Design a protein around this nucleic acid. Structure first.
Lengths: 119, 122, 54, 115, 206
RNA sequence: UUGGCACCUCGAUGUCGGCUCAUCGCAUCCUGGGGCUGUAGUCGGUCCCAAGGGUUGGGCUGUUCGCCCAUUAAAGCGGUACGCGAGCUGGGUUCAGAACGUCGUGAGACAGUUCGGUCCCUAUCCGUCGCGGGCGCAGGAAAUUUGAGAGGAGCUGUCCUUAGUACGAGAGGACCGGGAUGGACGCACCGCUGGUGUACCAGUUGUUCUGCCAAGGGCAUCGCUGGGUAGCUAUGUGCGGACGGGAUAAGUGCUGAAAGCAUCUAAGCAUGAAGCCCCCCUCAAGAUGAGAUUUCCCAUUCCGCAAGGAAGUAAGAUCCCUGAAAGAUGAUCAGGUUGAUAGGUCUGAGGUGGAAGUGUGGCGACACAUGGAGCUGACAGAUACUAAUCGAUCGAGGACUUAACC
């Protein structure tokens, strides 16, 4: 199957509803290794909606993506920035939109960290 | 897929209305019985006009069930009520008519008087 | 669930064979020269494979 | 893998059968052998189910005759099916009609949709 | 007294000239080349060794090269061996296609059966369990271990472990149809082994 | 077993009966072989060789036993702390509570009866099931095996034919020998019937949230209900215990003395069983007796006088990392940029079913077209898009004696 990551059925989808929206706003994230590998196979489903960019293509991410603030002095939401500027950036690449940059151990957990860029 | 201690809707006007099983006449111990096997049964209810009445150890033949019947075609026959037709401990029935459809996997053995009395041999 | 006898000073110290821990996969940082962990970021360099990533 | 699967048994994809909507009344001409003679009987009824994949798509037809519901599956691509005819099409919002196995008598009709 | 080997893919359902539907595996055996003909005069027994896969450059070792290159055809990944064949029919390097077999003969099938991992003493040995109610805190456990006085457990009582993975053979099977133009064997029955795992296909002792 | 004796155990050895896993003996219940028979035939009785396999499901009883119902080819007996309570149950006796009969003025008793009554533990060692790390195996490494040696499997009924035949007065009804088909358990699997499928899709309720409608999101056990692909599954599907050989057991024999005959004997032979050893299958060279072949790498640089030592490598392997056909973690296993190993990607397969939006019919609930659409978790197929970077250690220099040839 796939991975579960300590959460129940409900909580892991409520986990990844923050690890995409905070990933689109703050543009880089330090999670663990295994939380990275459950975003490399998820976030790349959300960015391809920005390639489609139509009406019903819009109303799928709005079911998923939170309503937080992405750009002050612009009032640009995390939904809007996925389609305004990200859609301009990736008109040519076919798949493969997140890097995995492995850090060292977390201190108290022994957790093998990671860093994800939007490449 | 009829076990011990199941209750069966009876398909002839030979006297009985509902019949419960004892043992499938297979080997030492057989669990189920799909179609065409022969059960020793008893009679939990009968019609008031009854040749065979309440509380009689009877020997009977499964006709139609909620089980499959894997033909070599791959076609699976599956009815919507478990049933019997009471026989006279032979390859021959003892009732007059046979209510409802009868599965065609009785012709594998020679129960052809049940076949000849069937109204729709499905 | 009771140890019937105390463990002597042999069968204790034969259980600490496979309780040892090794040195991990440790290479050299290609830019700032120090020892690097394999397939992770040399935190002294801040680099990985070509780039001191901010 | 799966391309190599069907490219063997594309020669047995029997294309004589009219592709129909799962859930509609329908008759089937089944060739059988009774007494070393080849006859054809006709099995009317509504389709509960179309499922499967490739050569192994099995469907079924339910007939409610003499008050005992008869369900009778068939894989689609058999040589032991002669002729399949759509008598009335049907509309069902669902796709597999398992609830028809209980309801009888006019809470179980499917309305003809004019095609 | 024969045999080739191939790679399992998965089940199908194939018609055979009737309404008779047959469970059918899809065994693909790209044409095997004999890598060594072992003789009884030096190796002490009469056998032969096949080979099956198209190895790449980086996959091979140098001792896998020099074993092949005497009868230089190709480095092949899987190497197995068949005791008891006609040695007088073959030479070192001969290509063996599917042309041996027909669609009507008794055929033996060995293999490498699937895995179930660490799963224990009901699924691993078929044993029953204690009752699921009437206050019993006993179910899914491997039974009593033995009587008192012999002070040990007998070697032959069964216990939880790692089900599957072992080599398992199914005797007296049969080939449905031979399609040698894509190197395909279709065998009547369910053959052990997961997807892409390797199977010897003999002719059984009837 | 009912019992004797009081030897171990009263600084505790928990006791009957079922459930769980079975193992062992043979005085055998079936199955194999036979001998005699008051053995016509079919059933039978009875001893003999046989322990390889099997030994049903229930109502009553706390039940063991036994009766009984219904089958079966058969419903075997007996151990093993009246096997198994650091595996399970607590109905049973054997704690106080309660009551009945009887005993005793009485408190109270009763192997007479009834109702209710806390079953604890985290595994050191030996013992098993499974996996691995090290060194061994006079050089290092790569794959395949011979097989010492072990284990599993080793049950069978109905029906057809010979043949209604020999036999019998009939009634009845065959051995011997062919073919077909099942039950019982056993290995394997997911195409088919269904089962589960909590990061799949569709509907629908209460209520909150994204400013509102629309459309959604959360929570309500996956909120519930109908489906559900891969995956693991059984009742589903395949095949399985085959055909035989070798030597015997009881028998059945010849031949033939001792002991002019007789005699299955002492010599000399042949038969003869589901038994026994191989044949079938799995495991297996740590089988320290360490086997056998196939190729690769080769005899390098330093001490030391040698003996010996370390220190870079070969062949190959490891750390590591993307991985699941494998998966407790190790292992196995597909790969690591001369690459399709994982994820995305664009196609398809299967599922679900007619997306929102728009337009129109309708007072609206709602339909209808757009449109086999829309969405899709593990599936297979292409694509270098995305990381498997660079590195790094480990790892042979091959003894002595004799023979053999050279």
């Amino acid at each position: 199957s796939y991975r579960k990551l300590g959460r129940t059925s409900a909580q892991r989808k409520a986990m990844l509803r923050d690890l995409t929206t905070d990933l689109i706003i703050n543009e880089r994230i330090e999670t663990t290794e295994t939380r990275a590998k459950e975003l490399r196979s998820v976030v790349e489903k959300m960015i391809t909606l920005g390639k489609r960019g139509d009406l019903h293509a819009r109303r799928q991410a709005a079911a998923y993506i939170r309503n937080e603030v992405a750009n002050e002095e612009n009032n640009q939401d995390a939904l809007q920035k996925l389609f305004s500027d990200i859609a301009t950036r990736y008109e040519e690449r076919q798949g493969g939109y997140t890097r995995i940059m492995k850090l060292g151990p977390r201190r108290g957990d022994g957790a093998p960290m990671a860093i994800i860029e939007l490449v | 897929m009829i076990q011990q201690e199941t209750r069966l809707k009876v398909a002839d006007n030979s006297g009985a209305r509902e019949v419960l099983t004892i043992k499938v006449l297979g080997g030492s111990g057989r669990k189920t019985a799909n179609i065409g096997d022969v059960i020793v049964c008893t009679v939990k209810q009968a019609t008031p006009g009854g040749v065979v009445k309440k509380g009689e150890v009877v020997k009977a033949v499964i006709v139609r069930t909620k089980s499959g019947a894997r033909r070599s075609d791959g076609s699976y026959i599956s009815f919507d009520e478990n049933a019997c037709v009471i026989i006279r401990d032979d390859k021959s029935p003892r009732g007059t008519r046979i209510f409802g459809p009868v599965a065609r996997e009785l012709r594998e053995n020679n129960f052809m008087k049940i076949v000849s009395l069937a109204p729709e041999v499905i | 669930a009771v140890p019937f006898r105390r463990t002597s000073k042999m069968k204790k110290r034969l259980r600490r064979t496979h309780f040892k821990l090794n040195v991990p996969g440790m290479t050299e940082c290609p830019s700032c020269g120090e020892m690097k962990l394999s397939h992770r970021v040399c935190k002294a360099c801040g680099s990985y494979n070509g780039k001191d990533i901010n | 893998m799966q391309k190599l699967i069907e490219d063997i048994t594309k020669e047995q994809l029997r294309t004589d059968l009219p592709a129909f909507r799962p859930g509609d009344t329908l008759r089937v001409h089944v060739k059988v052998v009774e007494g070393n003679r080849e006859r054809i009987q006709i099995f009317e009824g509504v389709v509960i189910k179309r499922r499967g994949g490739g050569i192994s798509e099995t469907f079924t037809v339910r007939k409610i005759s003499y008050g005992v519901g008869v369900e009778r599956t068939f894989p689609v691509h058999t040589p032991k099916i002669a002729k399949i005819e759509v008598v009335r099409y049907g509309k069902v919002r669902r796709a597999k009609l398992y609830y028809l196995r209980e309801l009888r008598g006019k809470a179980a009709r499917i309305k003809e949709i004019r095609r | 007294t024969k045999g080739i080997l191939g790679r399992k893919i998965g089940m199908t359902q194939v018609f055979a000239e009737n309404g008779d539907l047959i469970p059918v595996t899809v065994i693909e055996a790209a044409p095997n080349v004999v890598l060594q003909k072992k003789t009884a005069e030096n190796d002490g027994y009469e056998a032969i060794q096949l080979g099956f896969d198209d190895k790449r450059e980086k996959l091979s070792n140098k001792p896998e090269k020099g074993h092949v290159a005497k009868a230089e055809t190709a480095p092949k990944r899987f190497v197995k061996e068949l005791r008891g064949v006609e040695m007088d029919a073959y030479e070192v390097g001969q290509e063996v296609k599917v042309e041996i077999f027909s669609a009507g003969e008794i055929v033996d099938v060995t293999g490498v059966s699937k895995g179930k991992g660490f799963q224990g003493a009901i699924k691993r040995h078929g044993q029953s369990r204690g009752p699921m109610s009437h206050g019993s805190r006993y179910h899914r456990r491997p039974g009593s271990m033995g009587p008192v006085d012999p002070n040990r457990v007998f070697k032959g009582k069964l216990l939880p472990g790692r089900m599957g993975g072992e080599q398992i053979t199914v005797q007296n099977l049969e080939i449905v149809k031979v399609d040698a133009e894509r190197n395909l064997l279709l065998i009547k029955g369910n053959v052990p082994g997961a997807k892409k795992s390797l199977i010897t296909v003999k002719s059984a002792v009837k």
